[PDB]
Design a protein around this ligand. Sequence first.
Ligand SMILES: Cc1cn([C@H]2C[C@H](O)[C@@H](COP(=O)(O)OP(=O)(O)O[C@H]3O[C@H](C)[C@H](O)[C@H](N)[C@H]3O)O2)c(=O)[nH]c1=O
Ligand SMILES: Cc1cn([C@H]2C[C@H](O)[C@@H](COP(=O)(O)OP(=O)(O)O[C@H]3O[C@H](C)[C@H](O)[C@H](N)[C@H]3O)O2)c(=O)[nH]c1=O
Ligand SMILES: Cc1cn([C@H]2C[C@H](O)[C@@H](COP(=O)(O)OP(=O)(O)O[C@H]3O[C@H](C)[C@H](O)[C@H](N)[C@H]3O)O2)c(=O)[nH]c1=O
Ligand SMILES: Cc1cn([C@H]2C[C@H](O)[C@@H](COP(=O)(O)OP(=O)(O)O[C@H]3O[C@H](C)[C@H](O)[C@H](N)[C@H]3O)O2)c(=O)[nH]c1=O
Ligand SMILES: Nc1nc2c(c(=O)[nH]1)N[C@H](CNc1ccc(C(=O)N[C@@H](CCC(=O)O)C(=O)O)cc1)CN2
Ligand SMILES: Nc1nc2c(c(=O)[nH]1)N[C@H](CNc1ccc(C(=O)N[C@@H](CCC(=O)O)C(=O)O)cc1)CN2
Ligand code: NA
Ligand code: NA
Ligand code: NA
Ligand code: NA
Lengths: 398, 398
Amino acid sequence: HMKIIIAGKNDIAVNVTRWLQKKKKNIEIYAICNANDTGIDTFQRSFKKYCKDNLIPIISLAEAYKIDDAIFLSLEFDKIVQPSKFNHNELFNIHFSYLPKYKGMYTSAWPILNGEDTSGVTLHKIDHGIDTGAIIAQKEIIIQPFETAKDLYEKYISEGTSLVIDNISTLLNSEYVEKEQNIKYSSYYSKKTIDYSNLELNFSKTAFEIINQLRAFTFREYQLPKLDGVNIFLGDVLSSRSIMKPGSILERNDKEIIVSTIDYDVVLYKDNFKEILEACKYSDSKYIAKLIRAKSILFEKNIYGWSPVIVAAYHGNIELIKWLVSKGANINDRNYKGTTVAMYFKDYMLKSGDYSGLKMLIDLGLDLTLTDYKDYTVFDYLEKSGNKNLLQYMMAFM
Amino acid sequence: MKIIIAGKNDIAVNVTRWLQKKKKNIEIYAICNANDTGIDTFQRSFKKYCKDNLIPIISLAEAYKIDDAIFLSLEFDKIVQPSKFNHNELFNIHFSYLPKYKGMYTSAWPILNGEDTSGVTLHKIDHGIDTGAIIAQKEIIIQPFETAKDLYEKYISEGTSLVIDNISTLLNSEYVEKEQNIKYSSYYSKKTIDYSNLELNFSKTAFEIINQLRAFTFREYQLPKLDGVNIFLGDVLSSRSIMKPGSILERNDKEIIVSTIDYDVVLYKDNFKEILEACKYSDSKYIAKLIRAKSILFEKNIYGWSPVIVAAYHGNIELIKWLVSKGANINDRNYKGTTVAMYFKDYMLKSGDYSGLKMLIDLGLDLTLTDYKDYTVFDYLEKSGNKNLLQYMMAFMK
Ligand SMILES: Cc1cn([C@H]2C[C@H](O)[C@@H](COP(=O)(O)OP(=O)(O)O[C@H]3O[C@H](C)[C@H](O)[C@H](N)[C@H]3O)O2)c(=O)[nH]c1=O
Ligand SMILES: Cc1cn([C@H]2C[C@H](O)[C@@H](COP(=O)(O)OP(=O)(O)O[C@H]3O[C@H](C)[C@H](O)[C@H](N)[C@H]3O)O2)c(=O)[nH]c1=O
Ligand SMILES: Cc1cn([C@H]2C[C@H](O)[C@@H](COP(=O)(O)OP(=O)(O)O[C@H]3O[C@H](C)[C@H](O)[C@H](N)[C@H]3O)O2)c(=O)[nH]c1=O
Ligand SMILES: Cc1cn([C@H]2C[C@H](O)[C@@H](COP(=O)(O)OP(=O)(O)O[C@H]3O[C@H](C)[C@H](O)[C@H](N)[C@H]3O)O2)c(=O)[nH]c1=O
Ligand SMILES: Nc1nc2c(c(=O)[nH]1)N[C@H](CNc1ccc(C(=O)N[C@@H](CCC(=O)O)C(=O)O)cc1)CN2
Ligand SMILES: Nc1nc2c(c(=O)[nH]1)N[C@H](CNc1ccc(C(=O)N[C@@H](CCC(=O)O)C(=O)O)cc1)CN2
Ligand code: NA
Ligand code: NA
Ligand code: NA
Ligand code: NA
């Protein structure tokens, strides 16, 4: 009967909480929610919803301050805590950097902006200061040259979650070891350091720096970078070097804009994600390939969570799914309610009366055992619509 | 064969010096910077050197028309247009390890950013800013306590070598060039720092703020200020105040302690004027108690007087001994080339006390050096009629 307060948001809060509920069923869990948590699952899960849907008490921070014999774990919590208000000193935080670097804000952007090759997540003690307390455990993260800030945020969430899981016992049982943070290389960025109201690309900068600006500001659900009004989804560095002043527009067609920089010219790729989603209903890979400038655009998602592979499956675009998956697409990709490819494919099967592509999907690793966020399999769904015939067909592949 | 040297400071002067020694063949032409006052300062006036050594001063427009020359920029203040030349032998010394830190304030920015290294780079000039192909380069290690001025001087010293070690190949067309890498290329325009409006930022880590101090410590432009008080470096404390970053925890006459994001910082009031005044007559024990940042012992006033210089003029042998034990240059010079030995002779002359000289010489005093009029200490004594001091000082030469 230990107690834990989980304060925070997003898949990290939700996933730590379920690990706790799966593996530590006699703990008392209390929750604090971020101010801007809407109760609606988005590109991240709502932690507030998860808690309402799993009878987890939501409390205030003032309540939390009073609870005794509780550990306090912050997972992307929106508040600077006052440690001395607590009874105890068992206050912890995952921070999304390799501390002591990159204390504070926008750790998905700054390391990219500054040109880093790596970052990390850090488990540490909460003291009065911002991401300043003693370090318990850390993990280095490689940032790939092609990765955006959104790509990086996902690795923080994913790696942060495992870091917590792999140490939380020691937090609960006071087995853990801490070490004050170094002086050397400590760095911090406040909220003023980037104005997300007033983004503008700075072209009086190197090709490296401009691509890094792009990468760092590519996070579609907040924004994409813009050039003369029009959204951009990555780019590349050309071998030419224009005599025109940095920022000068050398060329502009339907796919791309070419620009002078301090050094090498760059091409900026027009965001054509919407066009591509639309095209993934019926078009073959030959066609989709011609639209593809940055390869990673194939794994983007609209507001519903629809990726290309998802829209493909819904329309029964089997050969397109073969190619998407060959390019890296998740065969069991999910929307923002956890609806799998298989579930989308099921509606196709049912509308069309054609079940013959299921084998070939299965052969690509499609998993029918998966549950959406209300714990329903694709089978449960066939039961509730009364399509027992298809349910029995699909069962053959288990 | 002809060479156009366009630039300023001891880099331009000493390169020119070396050429007039080792390459008596060459016709030299100079271009000077707009803020070369004609008068020696902490750096030698190149304009002055060219007037005193029969080198015609010309404009950049003139330099475009000179055939059969190479063009060598050594902190030249202008963006040149390669295409207006009759040839392509266009070279520059840039004060960074290219391709990082193109552009401006390269003695500030690597420090601000926390770099342990920088360097100098010989490269071809093309239309862009520090963008052309690399011919040679040298890493410079930035010691943890070196200021921007320390870094600047090393840039001057190391770029001087790098030119001398390579200039024949530039005059003979036997040099190799390699295009600059895309990756890590970085650049800072003049707008990136407003030197008329410098403001210490304590919403930062201790590391960052010391580095701000170091970066803006370049005395003959400016020192950083806290409440109109000039500051000469500082240190990082083990305490971590709870007060908001930038709160003054302590004030006295030697120092100011401030809260940061992480560790508290000690800021040292500038007491160089005081210290220089104490150097005339006080002993090492007094002077050591006045010192906070050790490198303040090497600072110079407007005349080019350091501590060891003031000590030598006033006959303070014990203090010289110690100054040197702490790393001071036994042969330090003012801005006219006048050496320690030349100040100490003045003292020997006026006091009649000749006693300290032997020890000084064992510590390194070099009587053979010449000022910027090509006078040794002996030439002055000879003119003076001081036969006895002439003889006596000559007895100690090694
Ligand atoms: C606000 C915002 C963020 N982003 C990117 C950069 C961020 O690193 C990433 C995540 O944004 P975010 O609002 O989740 O917050 P971050 O600023 O990453 O994390 C801070 O805020 C959290 C709530 C915690 O207090 C955390 N300990 C803080 O360091 O999204 C945008 O692209 N556009 C935006 O407008
Ligand atoms: C992918 C896709 C979906 N849709 C439809 C199907 C859904 O009924 C509706 C909402 O999409 P959504 O991703 O929010 O779906 P969800 O509500 O998450 O999933 C429901 O619909 C699926 C098709 C399965 O039947 C599942 N069993 C349902 O619970 O939009 C399209 O019209 N075009 C599309 O390209
Ligand atoms: C202007 C200025 C400079 N500084 C420091 C920072 C600089 O790195 C250092 C030297 O100043 P600086 O004006 O000589 O030039 P920097 O900005 O170093 O060098 C650029 O300007 C030169 C004239 C050349 O064109 C060179 N190619 C450029 O790199 O002094 C101050 O501390 N306060 C100041 O107000
Ligand atoms: C270092 C120092 C110098 N002085 C004086 C000595 C000079 O007469 C005057 C100008 O200083 P400076 O460094 O510009 O001297 P310079 O003009 O460089 O050198 C002359 O004066 C020296 C003392 C030697 O005789 C030398 N051989 C001369 O060429 O200031 C002081 O009063 N207090 C001092 O602490
Ligand atoms: N005590 C304390 N509280 C914490 C942590 C800590 O390690 N110490 N760790 C987590 C970090 N949480 C944050 C960090 C920063 C903000 C934030 O909002 N920062 C603004 C604050 C500006 C301001 O304070 O005015 C900024 O840095 O620009 C919000 C939650 C959770 N709470
Ligand atoms: N061609 C060209 N000319 C050169 C070099 C070069 O490699 N290419 N190498 C040297 C670098 N000299 C400089 C570099 C920048 C400035 C300067 O003043 N820059 C302002 C820009 C002024 C402007 O363009 O508006 C800035 O960078 O913010 C002055 C001399 C000298 N001449
Ligand atoms: Na902001
Ligand atoms: Na260009
Ligand atoms: Na400026
Ligand atoms: Na503090």
